[PDB]
Amino acid sequence: PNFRGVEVEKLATMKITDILPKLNARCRRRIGKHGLSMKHLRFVNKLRLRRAAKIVRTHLRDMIIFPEMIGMTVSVYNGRQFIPVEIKPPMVGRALREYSMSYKIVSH
Amino acid sequence: KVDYPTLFADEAAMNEALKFIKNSKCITHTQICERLRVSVALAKRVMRQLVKSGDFAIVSKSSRMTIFKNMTK
Amino acid sequence: MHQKYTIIVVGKDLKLVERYVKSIVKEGRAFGISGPCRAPVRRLTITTRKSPCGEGTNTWHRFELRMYKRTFWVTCGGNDISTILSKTVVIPGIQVTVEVEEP
Amino acid sequence: RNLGSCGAEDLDSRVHPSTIFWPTEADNINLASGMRETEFCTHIAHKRECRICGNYNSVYRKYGLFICRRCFKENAGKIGFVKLH
Amino acid sequence: MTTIVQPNDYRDLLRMFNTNIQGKVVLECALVGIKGIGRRFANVALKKANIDVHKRAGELTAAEEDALMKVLEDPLSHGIPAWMLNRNNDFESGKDMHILVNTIASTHRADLERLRKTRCERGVRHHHNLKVRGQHTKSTGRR
Amino acid sequence: MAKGNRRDLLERNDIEVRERDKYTVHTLGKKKNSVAVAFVKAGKGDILVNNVPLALVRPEILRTKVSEPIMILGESLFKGLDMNIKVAGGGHVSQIYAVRQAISRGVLASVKDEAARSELRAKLVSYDRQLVVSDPRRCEAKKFGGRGARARRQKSYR
Amino acid sequence: SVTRVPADVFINSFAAHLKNRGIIKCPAFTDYVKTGVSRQYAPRDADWFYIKAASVIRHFYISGSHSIGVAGLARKYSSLQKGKTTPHHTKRASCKVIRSIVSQFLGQKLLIAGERGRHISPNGRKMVEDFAEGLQK
RNA sequence: AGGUCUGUGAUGCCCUCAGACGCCCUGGGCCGCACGCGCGCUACACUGGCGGGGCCAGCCGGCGCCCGCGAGGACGCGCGGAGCCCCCGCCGUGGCCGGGACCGCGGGCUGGAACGCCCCCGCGCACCAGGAAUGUCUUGUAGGCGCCCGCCCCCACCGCG
């Protein structure tokens, strides 16, 4: 497919910052202005090490998806268990809160 | 339920819309709407045309309501 | 010599603030000071539930604090630095009536 | 861990230097000057509390009191508040 | 205006974008009958077309009907801003477009398709029919 | 925006001082939160509100309500003199009534023979008493039982 | 003077004079705006810009030597927001149009700036009075 | 034996007391929904809706210039008040321009962090005065209209005025 005009194959290797001006307001603010904390960066670096050379579990539910985090495998915490999540290009620009459900649907 | 137009065809702007009111003495937009079963805007236009002619005169004017009198008799 | 001075007075009771005034003005007739400018009253207001818990009918307390202010700034040239103390001593000091001075 | 470091592109993205807008509320100087120490209380947030009974619920910040409502009807007479009208 | 009698070409019922429109209502309000159009968009559309806005819709000649159509499939190039469009940054194109009746169904239906496979929290609630926003539901909206 | 008790108003510092000394008379009218200040002098029959003539006022419907004292009293007197009222306070109608009260008192303060003043007072009060005497009633406070002065929050017994 | 005539006649007459004299010109953005978040749809008339300008200059004349800022003009053209299943509330107008009008008037020297805001200049008073007497009869 | 040991260096008697019910950190919940009702808000339209203009309050109270449709933002100084209403016009009995719930792109603010809140375009649910039952009210009162404070990092259909 295409990602705001950018194709998937080349979407990989993209510098988050170069693709940055083609994203929504939340990511623009958080990245270009706010910045980011050390823990998130260490998470990124651990991800990079794992890619270059096991499910990398985490508590972060406010970490945005970098394009280089594609085809990655990861688990995330809801409060009681770790929830694996598979990534895809349309998944980019979004926080992991959406992809790890914190509860179950209600059936009487 | 009830449908009313907003645009005469040729002759209805004479056979009734005018020929039938000129006999009246006092008239009003909603009265002429309920009489000729046509929406009010057309009535406004026609009354403007008539005051242009001079047959009727305004006695009380206002955005909510204006009414006329038949001077021609 | 001449400095253009101001006197502030603050209080929560109307009687002392109206008694300090008479003394000070009576004392300053010679130096050229003149009466006050009674300022707008500052109304502190608090509404609180009359109960430590939610129960029964909902009844409210209505506390308030009035603060009164009188300002004589009419000393100025009529009073020099040293002579100001002459006026702040003969008056009857009251335990609660802060009076501040500033040119 | 005093010698570790990351790619610079991963270091230009750190947070805004302008410290934080989450300082604790201190009424006077007596409170503070500003291993486990690394994380004992790093969660810096407001903790304004009744200067009488030390409670974080129902504190009147109006006029700079910081007095609970239940810890207030008792001392209102001393402070100067009077119940009229 | 000042139009009493009907134009010889006055058309009593008009058909556009597979939708049918009456010829006695004013133009700017009639066009609201379509999906993807409203009052704000319409005036900004007619006006660029050098069309009058207070004329009964049925008396719209044929020449105006096209130019009005042209500025509606080609909004941006004709000048209208990018903040007056119902689709601002497409997911695939990255463009700013204005989509209409034939498209609303597809772009919406295709949106939810993307949310089920992505497994978002929002998509599932679109399935059992809850509230996607954070509205409370304990005591409201009882079928 | 204007309170009605301001020193600038009861003195009318708006007017230039040299002319200020001509307006011998002063007057007051009110209603609710509304005040009227009439500085009056000799003239040839003119009137003004906030730099506005009397006819071109906003109560196109109550213009006669403002003009009443003129018609009930006659014209020669008012033609004799001139005014320039200023008003400040809540609402439009309140201001209308304040103004008419102020006019009545000011014109009635001009005569010098108190017998004439009494006769005119009797003539005027007969038509209405509120052209001469201020209206006392005023907004009443509200209580915590409910959302109104006298009405209460609806009570459910079950 | 000017206050011895109702505003409605003066405003329209002056706006017509102004449009005839090319004193001010409608920019591009005047044809897709709604004039304030409070407003619901855009204006019907095609020459509201000139009416607004006339009203604003009359407002600058009334205040005389006193100064006005733009945001103080926006609070005299406010309205009421509706359509929110919530109690209504008041909102301020937009200030881009007002800024354009005052800047254009100042460029014509009818309007001299001060320390804060702007105030009428004697030329503007001259012109306003002249037209006022022109329409007096 | 109404409520409050969950307001307190107010407290009697029991139970917790080094894998702690002590204190601190990371996430989540208190907002979850086939369902019954209590206090409110918005509406069912012509005694009206929309567009432009004119214009007056009080508890009390902070403004200029420039960008941006707007929300908001960058600079720099101490200075300041609304809705109803009135006037001119469009609509013309149609679940229609009444009503704006629901939902889909987008732009911003708060904050360490949106699940929170604003603005723009589009979509446009019921609702035609509401059964058995029932509440409040006598002058500046009922009702209608809006404006400030409380808690509050953002947020008022709430409450005191």
From TrEMBL, chain A:
Keyword Plastid in record: no
Keywords for the protein's UniProt record, in alphabetical order: Ribonucleoprotein, Ribosomal protein
Keyword Ribonucleoprotein in record: yes
GO MF entries: structural constituent of ribosome
Biological process (GO), any one: translation
Gene Ontology, cellular component aspect: cytosolic small ribosomal subunit
Family: Belongs to the universal ribosomal protein uS19 family.
Protein name (Swiss-Prot/TrEMBL): Ribosomal protein S15
The species this protein was found in: Giardia intestinalis (strain ATCC 50803 / WB clone C6) (Giardia lamblia)
From TrEMBL, chain C:
Shown residues in whole-protein numbering: 21 to 123 of 126
Keywords of this entry: Ribonucleoprotein, Ribosomal protein
Official protein name in the record: Ribosomal protein S20
Gene Ontology cellular-component annotations: cytosolic small ribosomal subunit
Gene Ontology terms for molecular function: structural constituent of ribosome
Keyword Zinc-finger appears in the UniProt entry: no
Gene Ontology terms describing biological process: translation
Family in the record: Belongs to the universal ribosomal protein uS10 family.
TrEMBL record, chain E:
Database matches in Pfam families: Ribosomal_S13
The keyword Secreted belongs to this UniProt entry's keyword annotation: no
Alphabetized Gene3D superfamilies for the sequence: 1.10.8.50, 30s ribosomal protein s13, domain 2
Keywords from the named record: Ribonucleoprotein, Ribosomal protein
Domain of life of the native organism: Eukaryota
GO molecular function: RNA binding; structural constituent of ribosome
GO cellular component terms, semicolon-separated: cytosol; small ribosomal subunit
GO biological process: translation
Recorded family membership: Belongs to the universal ribosomal protein uS13 family.
PANTHER family in the record: 30S RIBOSOMAL PROTEIN S13/40S RIBOSOMAL PROTEIN S18, SMALL RIBOSOMAL SUBUNIT PROTEIN US13
Protein's recorded name: Ribosomal protein S18
Organism: Giardia intestinalis (strain ATCC 50803 / WB clone C6)
UniProtKB/TrEMBL annotation, chain F:
Record Pfam families: Ribosomal_S9
GO MF annotations, alphabetized: RNA binding; structural constituent of ribosome
Keywords: Ribonucleoprotein, Ribosomal protein
InterPro entries the UniProt entry points to: Ribosomal_Su5_D2-typ_SF, Ribosomal_uS9, Ribosomal_uS9_CS, Ribsml_uS5_D2-typ_fold_subgr
UniProt keyword annotation of Secreted present: no
UniProt record, GO biological process: maturation of SSU-rRNA from tricistronic rRNA transcript (SSU-rRNA, 5.8S rRNA, LSU-rRNA); translation
One GO CC term on file: cytosolic small ribosomal subunit
Designated name of the protein: Ribosomal protein S16
Organism of provenance: Giardia intestinalis (strain ATCC 50803 / WB clone C6) (Giardia lamblia)
